[PDB]
């Protein structure tokens, strides 16, 4: 079909303050179902981020009508930026606005990835009758759990000033004239982007003169507010999710950011609406399914038009009232690793996953990847523990993951160049015989104890091949002051044992035969999570100097069942 393109309508938002949309209209007679993204990287630069979305011109051409708008305060749109409070009002506003033209047929959706998925969640709390559907991919209803901190309760440091250096440098290049200033800050902010690490690793981290002047936010709301307090409520759309009867199409990737939140929403909207579920391997830079030492398959590469044809018949179902316009779709698409295959499944969790505990155990310590840690589904007999010193100024190195920023590109990461760290305990099952799926949630429950008043433990699942890469599946930490809650933390005492448990987000992989089973456990992933200072402190307004190193030990044995927790999936 055909359509017209109208460039910077103004839209009035409550407060007086005008936002600006283009109108890609389908040219028909009569009103038409409506398609709204929100974007705070200028609508009008649509290749930008089209390609790890959809061939959405294709709905246009369809009939639907698609509405791009710069939020308020960025580009063409009036007002003052600030991350996400004001996007709730806005969509309100904004949907409503829609929904009053003369083209709107009374039935609007949503679809978008990251920030322009988060939008969609603020959009779906509005209550606005006419939100038929909404597509948040690689996205979050809790901006706290990710991308900016996470279940662990430690700072996601590197998505912080690796998305606040992007912000900043589009707040520069599409000013209203140009500032002295801007030529340097340009360079600036190319500077922290080409070494996140590096600008993480300054101290006091609070202190930031360049990001701090250009985006206050990073610090007066991200920073300053470590706790899971009512700031970070405020914005958080979660709890809210489960009174919602939205249906929502989901999309996620293992090695990104947002893949924990993702996989909540989809739990929480999946009984009171149709959900929809979609999982590859992707990271948040890299939807390619090539990395440096894995390659997934030219069938991992985000297929773009497979899911452009889902989306068009998702919201025909919801927005267009074709009651079969999803008959054969599956509820969740999987990409399991391993295997590399996609695969169709009923539900998230899977039905049938066997919660399976894998013990830590071994002779000796486990320390390093040559060390005698084991793992087992049986209890280990003998009562150990693994010792290592944990200094602040050499912390573990983040190695793919759900990196957003400092080398996102590159999740499924060989750890061999960490392995020969004394603070990197591995514990690995035997040379496996028969393949173990495991799909779905990932935890670990250990046993530790530590000679700080606070700091911090991690876990890494990690399939180790016969050829000797040992790929990073899922990991987690947990900050110990915040080991009970993240909202009223309190600190430990040194020498005394506590369990804890670390939220490994999730994963979906076949571990063949001629495999292993390894986790990975220690006190720090930087910049993935920012260092603790094991202090007890404020770590954000602490220079490295005031820090103390921390004797850490990891406890095994029948009376310390130190475990992960891997969902077994039997077929």
């Given at each position: 079909g055909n359509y017209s393109v109208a460039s910077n309508v103004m839209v009035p938002m409550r407060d007086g303050v005008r936002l600006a949309v283009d109108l890609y209209r389908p040219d028909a007679d009569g009103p038409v179902p409506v398609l709204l993204v929100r974007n705070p990287y200028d609508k009008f630069d649509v290749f930008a981020w089209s390609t790890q979305s959809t061939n959405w011109l294709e709905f246009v051409r369809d009939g639907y009508a698609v509405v791009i708008q710069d939020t308020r305060g960025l580009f063409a749109s009036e007002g003052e930026f600030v991350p996400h409070v004001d996007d709730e009002a806005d969509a309100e506003d904004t949907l409503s606005w829609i929904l009053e033209q003369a083209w709107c047929d009374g039935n609007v959706g949503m679809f978008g990835v990251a920030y322009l998925g988060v939008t969609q969640w603020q959009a779906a709390v509005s209550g606005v009758g006419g939100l038929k559907a909404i597509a948040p991919s690689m996205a979050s209803a809790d901006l706290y759990r990710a991308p900016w901190y996470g279940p662990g309760g430690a700072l996601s440091v590197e998505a912080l000033l690796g998305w606040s250096a992007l912000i900043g440098t589009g707040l520069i290049t599409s000013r209203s004239d140009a500032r002295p200033e801007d030529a340097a800050d340009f360079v600036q902010l190319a500077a922290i982007l080409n070494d996140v690490a590096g600008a993480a690793s300054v101290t006091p981290l609070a202190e930031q003169p360049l990001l701090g002047r250009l985006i206050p936010w990073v610090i007066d709301q991200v920073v300053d507010h470590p706790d899971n307090d009512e700031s970070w409520?405020?914005?958080?759309?979660?709890?809210?999710?489960?009174?919602?009867?939205?249906?929502?199409?989901?999309?996620?990737?293992?090695?990104?950011?947002?893949?924990?939140?993702?996989?909540?929403?989809?739990?929480?909207?999946?009984?009171?609406?149709?959900?929809?579920?979609?999982?590859?391997?992707?990271?948040?830079?890299?939807?390619?399914?090539?990395?440096?030492?894995?390659?997934?398959?030219?069938?991992?590469?985000?297929?773009?038009?497979?899911?452009?044809?889902?989306?068009?018949?998702?919201?025909?179902?919801?927005?267009?009232?074709?009651?079969?316009?999803?008959?054969?779709?599956?509820?969740?698409?999987?990409?399991?690793?391993?295997?590399?295959?996609?695969?169709?499944?009923?539900?998230?969790?899977?039905?049938?996953?066997?919660?399976?505990?894998?013990?830590?155990?071994?002779?000796?310590?486990?320390?390093?990847?040559?060390?005698?840690?084991?793992?087992?589904?049986?209890?280990?007999?003998?009562?150990?523990?693994?010792?290592?010193?944990?200094?602040?100024?050499?912390?573990?190195?983040?190695?793919?993951?759900?990196?957003?920023?400092?080398?996102?590109?590159?999740?499924?990461?060989?750890?061999?160049?960490?392995?020969?760290?004394?603070?990197?305990?591995?514990?690995?099952?035997?040379?496996?015989?028969?393949?173990?799926?495991?799909?779905?949630?990932?935890?670990?429950?250990?046993?530790?104890?530590?000679?700080?008043?606070?700091?911090?433990?991690?876990?890494?699942?990690?399939?180790?091949?016969?050829?000797?890469?040992?790929?990073?599946?899922?990991?987690?930490?947990?900050?110990?002051?915040?080991?009970?809650?993240?909202?009223?933390?309190?600190?430990?005492?040194?020498?005394?044992?506590?369990?804890?448990?670390?939220?490994?987000?999730?994963?979906?992989?076949?571990?063949?035969?001629?495999?292993?089973?390894?986790?990975?456990?220690?006190?720090?992933?930087?910049?993935?999570?920012?260092?603790?200072?094991?202090?007890?402190?404020?770590?954000?307004?602490?220079?490295?100097?005031?820090?103390?190193?921390?004797?850490?030990?990891?406890?095994?044995?029948?009376?310390?069942?130190?475990?992960?927790?891997?969902?077994?999936?039997?077929?």
């Amino acid at each position: 079909g055909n359509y017209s393109v109208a460039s910077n309508v103004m839209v009035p938002m409550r407060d007086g303050v005008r936002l600006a949309v283009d109108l890609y209209r389908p040219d028909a007679d009569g009103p038409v179902p409506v398609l709204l993204v929100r974007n705070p990287y200028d609508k009008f630069d649509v290749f930008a981020w089209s390609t790890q979305s959809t061939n959405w011109l294709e709905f246009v051409r369809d009939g639907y009508a698609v509405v791009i708008q710069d939020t308020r305060g960025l580009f063409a749109s009036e007002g003052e930026f600030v991350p996400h409070v004001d996007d709730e009002a806005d969509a309100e506003d904004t949907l409503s606005w829609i929904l009053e033209q003369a083209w709107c047929d009374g039935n609007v959706g949503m679809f978008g990835v990251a920030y322009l998925g988060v939008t969609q969640w603020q959009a779906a709390v509005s209550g606005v009758g006419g939100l038929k559907a909404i597509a948040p991919s690689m996205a979050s209803a809790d901006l706290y759990r990710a991308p900016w901190y996470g279940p662990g309760g430690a700072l996601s440091v590197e998505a912080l000033l690796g998305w606040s250096a992007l912000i900043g440098t589009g707040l520069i290049t599409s000013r209203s004239d140009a500032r002295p200033e801007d030529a340097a800050d340009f360079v600036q902010l190319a500077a922290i982007l080409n070494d996140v690490a590096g600008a993480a690793s300054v101290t006091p981290l609070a202190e930031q003169p360049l990001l701090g002047r250009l985006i206050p936010w990073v610090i007066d709301q991200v920073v300053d507010h470590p706790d899971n307090d009512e700031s970070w409520q405020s914005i958080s759309l979660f709890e809210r999710l489960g009174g919602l009867a939205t249906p929502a199409l989901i999309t996620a990737g293992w090695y990104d950011g947002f893949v924990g939140e993702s996989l909540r929403t989809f739990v929480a909207v999946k009984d009171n609406a149709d959900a929809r579920l979609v999982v590859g391997p992707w990271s948040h830079s890299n939807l390619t399914g090539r990395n440096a030492d894995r390659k997934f398959g030219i069938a991992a590469t985000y297929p773009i038009q497979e899911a452009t044809t889902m989306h068009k018949a998702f919201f025909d179902r919801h927005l267009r009232g074709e009651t079969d316009a999803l008959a054969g779709v599956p509820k969740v698409r999987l990409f399991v690793m391993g295997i590399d295959e996609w695969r169709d499944e009923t539900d998230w969790p899977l039905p049938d996953t066997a919660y399976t505990p894998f013990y830590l155990g071994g002779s000796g310590a486990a320390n390093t990847s040559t060390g005698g840690g084991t793992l087992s589904t049986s209890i280990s007999g003998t009562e150990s523990a693994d010792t290592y010193l944990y200094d602040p100024a050499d912390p573990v190195p983040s190695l793919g993951g759900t990196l957003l920023f400092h080398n996102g590109d590159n999740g499924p990461a060989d750890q061999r160049p960490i392995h020969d760290r004394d603070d990197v305990l591995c514990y690995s099952t035997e040379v496996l015989t028969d393949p173990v799926e495991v799909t779905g949630t990932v935890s670990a429950r250990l046993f530790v104890s530590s000679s700080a008043v606070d700091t911090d433990f991690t876990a890494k699942l990690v399939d180790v091949f016969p050829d000797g890469r040992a790929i990073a599946l899922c990991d987690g930490i947990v900050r110990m002051r915040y080991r009970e809650t993240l909202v009223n933390p309190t600190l430990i005492e040194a020498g005394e044992i506590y369990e804890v448990a670390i939220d490994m987000l999730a994963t979906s992989n076949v571990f063949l035969p001629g495999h292993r089973i390894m986790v990975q456990v220690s006190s720090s992933n930087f910049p993935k999570y920012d260092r603790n200072s094991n202090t007890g402190g404020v770590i954000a307004r602490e220079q490295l100097e005031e820090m103390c190193t921390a004797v850490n030990r990891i406890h095994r044995g029948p009376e310390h069942p130190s475990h992960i927790v891997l969902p077994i999936i039997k077929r």
